[PDB]
Swiss-Prot record:
Residues 80-98 are annotated as: Interaction with ASF1A. The gene is CREBBP. Disulfide bonds: none annotated. This is CREB-binding protein. The lineage of its organism: Eukaryota, Metazoa, Chordata, Craniata, Vertebrata. It is linked to Chromosomal aberrations involving CREBBP may be a cause of acute myeloid leukemias. Translocation t(8;16)(p11;p13) with KAT6A; translocation t(11;16)(q23;p13.3) with KMT2A/MLL1; translocation t(10;16)(q22;p13) with KAT6B. KAT6A-CREBBP may induce leukemia by inhibiting RUNX1-mediated transcription. Residues 3-110 form the Bromo domain. It comes from Homo sapiens (Human). The chain holds residues 1083 to 1197 of 2442 of the full protein. Changing residue 80 to E/R: Abolishes interaction with ASF1A.
Length: 115
């Protein structure tokens, strides 16, 4: 199966929008982590492949996904980075877990629809 750019965008953008609609839980994930500004300069020692919502949105808007699983992989890279870097008691970790619950719920019927 070949997926057209607008087909991926129409099917997947609502799932991304469901993540942005979570407050406060989307807030840590809206822009790329800036370790110096945020006071966490060890971040890139630990997270080798950063990912965030703004990057995923741009990739969806600019045809950088050819297959829905490439989009799913980037969302999960964002989640796995947050569970790797952050302590289990932290806001970012718990907010990541909430986003992963929302995403699992939204993405399943969409994958079924895409075939
Ligand atoms: C009202 N409210 C605001 C926040 C919030 C907002 C941002 C961060 C973190 C938090 C909070 F949850 F701490 N920001 C952040 C800081 C440290 C790390 S470490 C990591 O992996 N990430 C993704 C981040 C992100 C990025 C800038 C926005 C949560 N509620």
């Amino acid at each position: 199966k070949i997926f057209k750019p607008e087909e991926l965008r129409q099917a997947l953008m609502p799932t991304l929008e469901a993540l942005y609609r979570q407050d406060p839980e989307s807030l840590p994930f809206r822009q790329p982590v800036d370790p110096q500004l945020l006071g966490i300069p060890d971040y890139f020692d630990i997270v080798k492949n950063p990912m965030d919502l703004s990057t995923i949105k741009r990739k969806l808007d600019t045809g950088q996904y050819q297959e829905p699983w490439q989009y799913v992989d980037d969302v999960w890279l964002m989640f796995n980075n947050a569970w790797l870097y952050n302590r289990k008691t932290s806001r970012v970790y718990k907010f990541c877990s909430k986003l992963a619950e929302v995403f699992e719920q939204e993405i399943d019927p969409v994958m079924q629809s895409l075939g």
